[PDB]
């Protein structure tokens, strides 16, 4: 029974045998339980002063790898178990739940949500460009079919890159890795259809000037000159090539 | 704590670190239970987070539209993003460290990030000078060249990267003309 271990910290406060218990370390030198607890407590103070106007939309959830899985599904285009594409993921409208982080109630959902809104836009944009043929202002047009098919190709590559590169990665890594892809996606969403705060290119509604068919073979040339300033130079070159492929065929 | 710091580096002010349209991200003075020294360190970091937020807003403002205009202005925004990329990488490393030891202290982060407190302000000063003087087209190149004579080696290397992107644009235009 001699085999017990004892503390090697000897303090200058008890001159007998101290237990060794510290002073309840400071908030900023430890977290993950006290972080969330302090955040929840500050939000509780604010909710007391507000009359309970937070109501913890997803106070905690899911985990790391499961929240990452839901976010990766939303980025693929299947809305997450707390996220709808082009729809508020959480029923909290404070930046703890729309929050890169705060450890606050909803803030665990919020770190995902802040990047998620872009992913929901990406999902709806990938649906917009997923089929090469579409009703109304998108029917007929071989250059339009080529453009939409190549965009769906890139959307698919983006969706396979997500939830295949970052399995079980924290939200921060997921968002940092996907920021350079989602910004290009958002630029193309302004260029293309629904999946954006501007439906199509032009307007912000289902009556956007975005051409199709030979009208698109026009439209794209000015859109290509007028903007290529994010990451579209190789992509826009390929898109112009494939859009001209039906035009070049006809000619 | 550590997660909220990473959030602030991600540009989303929280309850302790609040976003002010005028100041950017800053530490809330009202957060109880922090020792004043901890509040001071947090606010020193929050100054960087504020500058990061403002820089991100500027980058989005001047790249996100596909008034000052030009391929040099776009290159400037791309340069700013590429200069924040090393900050993003350092933030990822800090995140991994905090995932490895949840008991890690803020002093470790402040030491690991102190170099960015010096790198970011100089580039932000140069960018704000370009903005305030409405430097346009190749005059942005002129301004960057003038700023390249600065003494900060980290700043020198960052500005060299920006200048290299701008020279790639200048050389493309020169090739087209010539």
């Amino acid at each position: 029974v001699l085999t017990y271990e004892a503390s090697r910290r000897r303090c200058w406060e008890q001159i007998g045998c101290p237990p060794g218990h510290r002073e309840e370390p400071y908030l900023t030198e430890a977290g993950r339980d006290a972080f969330d607890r302090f955040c929840r407590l500050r939000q509780g103070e604010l909710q007391v002063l507000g009359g309970a106007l937070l109501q913890a939309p997803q106070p905690v959830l899911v985990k790391e790898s499961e929240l990452v899985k839901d976010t990766l599904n939303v980025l693929l285009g299947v809305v997450s178990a707390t996220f709808s594409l082009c729809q508020p993921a959480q029923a909290f409208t404070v930046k703890r739940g729309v929050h890169v982080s705060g450890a606050s109630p909803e803030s665990v959902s919020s770190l995902l949500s802040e990047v998620a809104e872009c992913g929901t836009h990406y999902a709806r944009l990938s649906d917009f460009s997923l089929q090469p043929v579409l009703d109304s202002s998108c029917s007929k047009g071989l250059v339009f079919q080529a453009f939409t098919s190549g965009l769906r190709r890139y959307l698919q590559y983006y969706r396979a890159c997500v939830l295949s590169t970052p399995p079980t990665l924290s939200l921060l890594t997921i968002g940092f890795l996907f920021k350079k892809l989602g910004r290009q996606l958002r630029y193309l969403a302004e260029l293309c259809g629904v999946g954006t705060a501007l439906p199509g290119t032009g307007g912000g509604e289902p009556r956007a000037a975005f051409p199709t068919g030979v009208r698109l073979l026009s439209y794209l040339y000015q859109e290509a000159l007028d903007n290529c300033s994010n990451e579209h130079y190789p992509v826009l070159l390929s898109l112009l090539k494939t859009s001209c492929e039906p035009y070049t065929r006809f000619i | 704590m550590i997660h909220e710091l990473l959030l602030a580096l991600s540009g989303y002010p929280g309850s302790i670190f609040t976003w002010n349209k005028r100041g950017g991200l800053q530490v809330s003075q009202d957060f109880p239970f922090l020792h004043p020294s901890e509040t001071s360190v947090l606010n020193r970091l929050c100054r960087l987070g504020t500058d990061y937020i403002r820089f991100t807003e500027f980058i989005e403002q001047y790249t996100g539209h596909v008034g000052l205009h030009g391929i040099y202005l776009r290159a400037f925004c791309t340069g700013l993003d590429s200069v924040l990329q090393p900050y993003r990488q350092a933030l990822l490393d800090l995140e991994q460290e905090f995932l490895a030891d949840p008991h890690l202290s803020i002093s470790h982060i402040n030491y690991s990030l102190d170099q960015f407190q010096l790198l970011f302000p100089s580039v932000m000063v140069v960018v704000e000078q370009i903005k305030s003087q409405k430097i346009h087209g190749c005059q942005i190149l002129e301004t960057v060249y003038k700023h390249s004579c600065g003494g900060l080696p980290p700043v020198r290397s960052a500005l060299e990267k920006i200048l290299a992107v701008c020279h790639g644009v200048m050389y493309k235009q020169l090739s087209a003309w010539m």
């Binding site: 040339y221 290509a224 000159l225 903007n227 290529c228 300033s229 994010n230 990451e231 579209h232 130079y233 190789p234 992509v235 826009l236 070159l237 112009l240 090539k241 001209c244 070049t248 000619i251 | 596909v66 391929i71 776009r74 290159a75 791309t78 992107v165 790639g168 644009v169 493309k172 090739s175 087209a176």
Partner: peptide, 26 residues
């Protein structure tokens, strides 16, 4: 024309127009 920093720079259609105009003219 191409504002993304990558006739690789510069967007045009003359690399495609010339082989088409050659046959139109023929």
């Amino acid at each position: 024309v191409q504002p993304d920093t990558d006739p690789l720079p510069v967007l045009m259609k003359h690399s495609v127009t010339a082989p088409l105009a050659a046959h139109v003219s023929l």
